[PDB]
Structures are given as structure tokens and as C-alpha cells.
């Protein structure tokens, strides 16, 4: 990446993509990728394979869906980070696992983990979108508690 707004597209191998400053778009493609949004409002999509997603500071967006495998988000900060999951809300299973939040797509091996979600506010993503539903932090908590 560069200080500008970049679009960084991986290939089928395990890739490291670093957006640097600016509002970037990072798409890993297949393989196990490491994606960094760094400073700015970035959109990170690991795609297939098991990807580590570091949106960095700023308000970052993370994509997930069927066939995305097991991806882990490591947030650093931002008051309006978001996850956008391409599935119906009733296909989602929310659980606490230690200090992580784990979101599974029912009927699949696809799972999205937010590392240290329960440690502190800077590790949280503030809105989780399913197809036509935006779930805020109080809503996420209620799903976790209900599905325990
Ligand atoms: Ca950036
Ligand atoms: Ca950049
Ligand atoms: Ca890749
Ligand atoms: Ca990938
Ligand atoms: Ca960022
Ligand atoms: Ca962020
Ligand atoms: Ca993935
Ligand atoms: Ca946040």
C-alpha cells in the first residue's frame, strides 16, 4: 500500500497486504492472508482461506459470508467499525469463547472470530450487519445470551 487510498487485491497464495494511511480496500483472495488497514477507514475482506484481519485505527469494515472459512479480526480502535455478513440473521450463531466473540454461519464450517472482543471497547466492532438487519453492541450481547 501507500499513503493514498489504495485497492489491494491478493492472489491465490498466502499474501500480506498493508494499506498504510488512507482509506483502503483490501481483498486477500484465496489462501491464508494477513490484511492490515492501518490508519484510515478501510474495508478488509479475507475471502476464502483462513485470514487474519487488522483493520487498525479508524472506522473499518470487514466482510464475511459463506465460503470465507475461519477469519479472525484484531481491532485497534475506532468508534464505528462494522462487520457485514452476507447471510440472513437467522443463519448466525453468536457465542462467547473466552474473551473472543465467535460468529458461525449455521450449516457451514465458516466462522468469524473477533479477538478479545470482551477485553475492552477498543477491541469491539460496533455494528454487525446481516442481510437486512443491523445489530448493535446491546443486540449482539442479547443474541450471545439467548443462544448460550
Ligand atoms: Ca488505511
Ligand atoms: Ca493506503
Ligand atoms: Ca491470497
Ligand atoms: Ca484469503
Ligand atoms: Ca483503519
Ligand atoms: Ca478500526
Ligand atoms: Ca477467509
Ligand atoms: Ca471499534
Swiss-Prot record:
| Swiss-Prot/TrEMBL domain comment | The Gly-rich region is probably involved in binding calcium, which is required for target cell-binding or cytolytic activity.
Q: Could you tell me what this protein is called?
A: Bifunctional hemolysin/adenylate cyclase
The source organism is: Bordetella pertussis (strain Tohama I / ATCC BAA-589 / NCTC 13251)
- In terms of the parent sequence, the fragment covers 1529 to 1676 of 1706
Can you list the disulfide-bonded cysteine pairs? Answer: none
Q: How is the polypeptide modified once translated? A: Released in a processed form.
- Report the subcellular localization: Secreted
Q: Which residue intervals correspond to the Hemolysin-type calcium-binding repeats? A: 9-26, 27-44, 45-62, 75-92
- Tell me the protein family, please: In the N-terminal section; belongs to the adenylyl cyclase class-2 family. In the C-terminal section; belongs to the RTX prokaryotic toxin family.
**Organism superkingdom:** Bacteria
> What does this protein do, in the record's words?
Bifunctional adenylate cyclase toxin-hemolysin that plays a crucial role in host colonization. It causes whooping cough by acting on mammalian cells by elevating cAMP-concentration and thus disrupts normal cell function.
